[model samples]
Target: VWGHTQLNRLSFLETVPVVPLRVSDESSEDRPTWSLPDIENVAITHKKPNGLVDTLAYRSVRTCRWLFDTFSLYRFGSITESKVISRCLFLETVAGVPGMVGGMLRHLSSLRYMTRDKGWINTLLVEAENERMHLMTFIELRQPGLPLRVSIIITQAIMYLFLLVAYVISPRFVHRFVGYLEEEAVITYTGVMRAIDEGRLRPTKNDVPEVARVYWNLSKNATFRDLINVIRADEAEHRVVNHTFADMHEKRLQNSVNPFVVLK
Candidate 1:
């Protein structure tokens, strides 16, 4: 019924499925399960900037990364588990904003124009939920102090407003920005994983959170390293998705279709 207006414009009318235009065939009952290869083979990939818009996005992400490193005093060898958890909490909070804003704007546009969204809304919403789940998992490990909590609130408010306005003006730019942001996320997680491996940093707790276990379907014996591995994979997937969306806009095909609908 959601895409009914678009379906009505079609010439042929037969027995139509009740739920059409699904972005993913996977059921809502379970989150996606990753294989060993899926978690271990996540490549650190970057999309080269094509033009001024992309360059601006890339530079913005780099500036933000610099600021993050400065504020957190993040160093590969000197980082601690507490620092990692704090950073994850802040990043995940800001990470959840863009997809919701983009999806909401597109949903409104589709309604106002009486057109279809080409299956983008569902994917965007899913990404937002996934990022929130990442935050939820991290919160179970360590609760933030009042100062950090206040900072997160202020940062989330600024990021939401900035992204909402930017998405309205140029969805492509915002997507590119998020792509680069996820690129940084993947890099950060990779660094943390390496630190854990080299014994420079270690999680104080060995037990994985119940939320993470259920969401990721991890075994009872899974540890923090396993959790980081799966979360890194998630960040890599988001990087690809956002980059693909930005590419669609560059090629003038964003309104036509979402290529990821079939992959789930």
Candidate 2:
């Protein structure tokens, strides 16, 4: 189960539930996996991920924007930790869908002014051309006078406003939980190993039912909930694969007759 023909595997061997933690929890278990060394147990959950608005204009920019969001959030966190958790939902949503869509569109928009992305310039151009064809097809499908361009404008305005709320207006760790993505990444990496070894995938999930208490402080955008839903789903999928690999590594040790590494 340990040997997979594809991808590099960082394995965490322990399978213990170690939450409500402190600095010791990270290294307490004999787990060998690709997880955050021990950021959560730092007892720094005071700050909240704060504020939200819409960014439909930047929606197409969200995916590319997300890679950027991490930097901003990370930079912001260097000064403050609480702010990281609060706005995580907004960050995740912005990048996952229309954001990825926006990223694609963002580059296409750039191509009008300069050369495409250096690595895949031709491929990206072809993709942009394909997008143009899609837009034309949509025009034909919905009829040319249906105000499609105007619709994008209005939605884009709302989306941009959402992002500006957190970034431009009220910046802080405003969410109920910070490091949500970080934790999700931890478990997702864990599940990846299990799939390769054991044939069944198990997912580790977080309890975020407290979202309502803090959500009202943000904007009252209807689509915001849907955006968050998709982020949660994405995290869930990550957990499945992460646990797979973690499980495999655990099994390998149990079966080893003379394990080289031990606590003798």
Candidate 3:
């Protein structure tokens, strides 16, 4: 277990059954039965912008890169374990917000119009939930101080309003923003990898957190480095997915379509 961390209790283990996070209780031939993969693998290559749309997408993402960098507590080399944990803890909190906002807006739209989700609601919700799982894994890794915890509260509140407003005004923009956000997540994990390799951040002897082991189903010999690799892969897919969503949204708008309602 994770020493005496709140997430390390045996009760915590009971919360997640031996099954994947979610599954169909009763399998129907017509209904799809979802199952979690034993291990996650992401090998997609980074795609370059193909048109003006992608150019604008990267621009919006850059705006967030600046915003995150401006508020950052310290530079990469100075990143202590506490700071890394705090930074990740805070960012993951915010990262989950856009998806929830996007999903909520879509969900309500479906309810009001009785049209169709066309997959928007499910996709965005999955994004939010997956990002949340990222935060949960990190919880066992470190405990935040009072200031950091306070920051999360404020950050979530602000992001919730900001994302909701952005989605209403222009979902494409928000999706692109999240796209860049995921890109930054990729960068963040890359930095962690380098820091671990260079000895800037020392790896704990415990290596894998108890929560991480249960969630990821890590092998008995898995190290902290292995955990980073898989999480990095997760962020990469999210980065690509959000950017793709932004692209789809823009195309729908140009076709004189309601971007929010139309899900691909």
Candidate 4:
């Protein structure tokens, strides 16, 4: 649907509602003239954080911001260890790790297209290249070796592919998986909070969840309390995407190429 680019707009379409790209501080001094109007104001969901839902939606606008900055620098950060480490922290830890939800979605989408011979070979090549780049991304600081890169690349590709298919396909069958993901994240976030409370995952000061950070800049009406709520709504969208994807996959598998075929 996105031409050459692979994107599920319904999934990541409203990835990040309150992007730094669009927020104003003027509202604090002069809040809006009208009422809150309901959380529906934002393009993303109106659900509050305390509610229930599954599958955290990936905030792509924020991701787009980070990615644009990263590649524009032409290396994770620069051509150094500290910089690479900094970038990796944002990528692998902050964004990459928690963002696994989004990655899982992409990996699943990729496999659907890559299942055939042509797609498989092309995807393998791309994944291999991705590995090489990822390694070079590392070797720009760490040890460099072709064998190590190839082996790790293949392994990474296969593992990523498996996760892609697994997360997407399984969610359709398991039912409560999306909720479980949020539940799991809550437990995980709680652990992080514990670590922070115990001074493990500490922030210098003012560091906050992406939602709060984004909200602070947006309408003061958009309170930090809503972060978790909006996310839950976003999570709810997963069911729709899953149903659409699974239905499409089934039809494609059947090669129901004929448009005239009836249910009979």
Candidate 5:
């Protein structure tokens, strides 16, 4: 069963599992599974700007949101499910970047300075993976064409570099920026759910993607609505996590334990 340098590598060992098995059945607190009530109760919350950095972050997010709405021709009452899928796809692509950049920089800082990173890196990496799963789920519903694909590539390139530099300069500012972005995500998803309820849009497909079902521990027969509910809840959780991180004093960030290690 053991492999030395050039020994045969089993396919199961080499390939990554969809859901890594836990030692016990007890779920880890960091990996959340929402109930129906929990999903239904996710509200659109705002974190008021308290200082210059907060104001800048809030304004930046607002500007980006305006540009997105204008270009997408997004109407709150008349949006289509297909349009929602496309928007989710693109937004999730960008959303997955920040956590990775933050985690990597912190990881490097810990190694370079030869000090502990507390627990930030693990939480950040988990957030990055969760966001990527959102993209993966939407992809099962709609495949982007060449023009959109090219645009995504360019957008990711610019976003990745920008966040990397920004995080290096001010981690708090970057976290606040992400908090604002997640707030917008919550609003967008809430609007989509409302549209469905008001008869403006209907999900053509009812079946939830397998990846989503497994990751969220959703039922096999879960519908599109269920999928959106869980995803929205996930965004809300990220909102709280980033805002909490941003709220911490700069000196404490590198030494304090992650508050989200036990977040429900």
Candidate 6:
């Protein structure tokens, strides 16, 4: 898992039960695969920008975006479109962690405080699982080197700690952080699709892999475009969700209610 040989193969998919795919608990343990609706059904939506919230989020995500672009082992501009698979792999590794950490903390907090997370816990965990599935899709397409995978493992660790701290300190800011991250993701995936359209990345038609086929249940002749469309749509939804989370948190704060406290 992400070059950490000691990590369980299934742990990456551990959030399967809570995802939008709505996998049943009984099948979740063994199926170990994600499910998704049709890509055609997926839509791109945006969240309205908050004044200060948007400002801080833009700066926050911009710093990380710069660092990511500066240090990425696979520079999208430098690599072949096919090789961009590694870029997705790396991004998905870190992208998946915030959801797990956020959901787990919310889970624990809910138990302690005797109030639910108003469904945030489950929603975030589902987002994390969806991200991991993105990694899984790319992994099916191409395997990364041990060195790159090791880098992913290390990055995930650091990010997990950082996001965990951010959530504990200010859930609102963390939500904004993730919201901005998803916004960036929208741009990244959009570029990928554009390349494919421009003859830069010509994927085989009807070459959908079994894993993607099973999860998405695409038509027998489904192409790679179908997959990327669904993935892009998923990111769009996440972008909206994180901003909504921040908005909800802001409202809670304005009402002078404890955001962390579950409803009575």
Please count the clashing residue pairs in each candidate, in the order shown.
0, 57, 0, 7, 0, 0
The alpha-carbon lDDT assigned to residue 5 of candidate 5 equals: 43
Q: Which stretches of candidate 5 lie over 4 Å from their true place?
A: 1-31, 250-254
The numbered model that scores best in lDDT is: 1
Q: lDDT tens digits, residues 1-264, model 4?
A: 466345533455475775555233312232112223352332322222221222222232235445645554734431432333233222222222212543445456557776422222222222223222222322333443474445545645654564455555553322233323333333332333344446544343232333233332345344322332333233333333333333434345322221212211
In model 6, pairs of residues that clash are: none
Q: Is candidate 3 or candidate 5 better by lDDT?
A: 5
In Å, residue 207's CA in model 6 sits off its true spot by 2.3
Judged by whole-model lDDT over C-alpha atoms, candidate 1 comes out at: 0.85
Q: Write the per-residue lDDT of candidate 5 for residues 28-127, one digit (tens) a residue.
A: 3345579967589799998887878999988899899889887867656467888889889999998889979979999999999999877889899888
lDDT, candidate 3, 1-264, per-residue tens: 346686555566575666563322221112211122422334334546655656676787787677777677456556777777767877789878887887899888879987766666766776777677778778778778797888789878887988898789888777777776676777778788778879887877447765565555567787776777777876776787777777777677422333444433
Residue 123, candidate 5: Cα error in Å is: 0.1
Q: What are the Cα lDDT values of the candidates?
A: 0.85, 0.31, 0.69, 0.34, 0.83, 0.70
Q: What is the lDDT ranking, best to worst?
A: 1, 5, 6, 3, 4, 2
Residue runs of model 4 more than 4 Å from their true location after superposition: 1-161, 165-217, 253-264
Error of 4 at 203 (Å): 17
Which digits, one per residue and each the tens of the lDDT, describe model 6 over residues 1-264? 356574646565677677764323211232222244444344434555666766776787888778867676446464364567777888899888887887898889879978745556766777877787777778878788898878887887788888888888878888888887887787777777777778677775447666666554557876777677778877877787778778877777422333333532
Positional deviation of residue 57's Cα in model 3 after best superposition, in angstroms: 6.7
Assess every candidate by TM-score: 0.87, 0.20, 0.72, 0.27, 0.87, 0.75
- Model 5 weakest lDDT span, ten residues long: 21-30
Rank the models by TM-score, top first.
5, 1, 6, 3, 4, 2
Off by over 4 Å in 6: 1-54, 73-79, 204-206, 253-264
The residue ranges of model 1 lying beyond 4 angstroms of the native Cα positions read 1-30
| TM-score-better candidate, 4 vs 5 | 5
Clashing pairs for predicted structure model 1, backbone only: none
When summed lDDT is taken over every stretch of 10 residues in candidate 3, the lowest stretch is 25-34
